[PDB]
C-alpha cells in the first residue's frame with residue numbers, strides 16, 4: 001500500500017483516554033442519579049457501557065460514550081412458538097417502557113439539569129460540564145430470548161436489550177453478547193482483531209476527509225461487524241498490517257461476490273449483518289471496499305507515480 005507499517009500501526013492504536021477514569025466516573029455519576037431517586041427503589045437495573053467504548057473499538061477520544069440503563073425487574077421476552085408470558089409465570093409488566101423512560105428522564109434531570117439533557121430518537125444525550133459527563137444514555141428493558149436455544153426454563157435465555165425509539169419503533173440489540181464475542185475473537189487473534197477494526201475505521205475517516213470516498217451508510221458498527229467476520233487466519237497468518245488489510249479487502253470482496261455474505265451475522269450472532277432493513281446495502285460495502293483498495297493503492301500506480 002501507500003502507507004508505511006509505522007503509519008498503519010499508529011492507526012491501530014486505542015484512542016487515548018485523556019481522563020483515566022472517564023468510563024468509571026461516567027458510570028458512577030449515572031448510577032448515582034438513579035440510586036438516589038426514590039422512584040427506582042423497588043426496581044432492579046444495570047448501568048453498563050456498550051458501543052465502541054464497551055468494545056474498546058473507539059478511535060476518537062472526543063466521541064460520546066454509550067451507556068445503557070437496562071431495567072431487569074421488568075423485561076421483554078421472545079418465546080418459542082405458541083408460548084406466552086403465563087407459560088413462564090410472568091405478567092405483562094408492572095411498568096411500561098414509556099413510564100420507565102420518564103422516570104429515567106426525571107432522575108437524569110435532577111442530577112444534570114434540564115438544559116443538559118436532550119432526548120434524541122434512540123438515546124438521551126447528557127452534556128454535563130459540572131460532573132464531566134458527555135454520554136449518550138439508552139434506557140432499555142432487558143430482552144429475554146428463549147426462542148434462540150428453545151428454552152422452556154425461565155432462567156435460561158439469551159440476554160439482549162429492547163427499547164422504543166422516540167418515533168416508537170422497536171429496537172432489539174444484544175450488546176453484552178456482542179462484547180463477549182468480540183473479546184473472544186480478540187483473544188484468538190493475539191489482540192489484532194480490534195486493532196484491525198480501529199485502522200479500518202480510521203481509513204474510512206481519512207477517505208472521507210481527503211475527498212476520496214464518502215458513504216454515510218458505512219457505520220462504525222458495520223465496520224466492526226465486517227472485520228469480526230474476517231476468518232482468524234487472515235489476521236494471524238501475516239506479519240504486517242499492510243498485508244493484513246490487503247487480505248481483508250480481498251476476502252470481503254470475494255464474500256460479497258460469492259453471496260456468502262448473506263450468512264454473516266453481526267458480532268452478537270443474533271441478527272444477520274446484511275438485510276433489507278439495514279441502513280447499508282451489499283452495494284454500499286462493495287463500494288467501500290473497492291474505494292479502500294484504490295485509496296491504499298494495493299494496485300501500485302504506474303511507475304509509483306500517482
Ligand SMILES: O=c1ccn([C@@H]2O[C@H](COP(=O)(O)OP(=O)(O)OP(=O)(O)O)[C@@H](O)[C@H]2O)c(=O)[nH]1
Nearest residue numbers: 050051052053063066173174219220221222279
Ligand atoms: O446494535 C446495534 C447498535 C448500533 N447500531 C447502529 O450503529 C450506529 C451507532 O450506534 P452505536 O453508537 O451503539 O455504535 P458504536 O458506538 O460502535 O459506533 P459509533 O458511536 O462510533 O458510531 C447507530 O446509528 C445504529 O444505526 C445497530 O444497528 N445495531
Ligand SMILES: [Mg+2]
Nearest residue numbers: 051052064066
Ligand atoms: Mg457509539
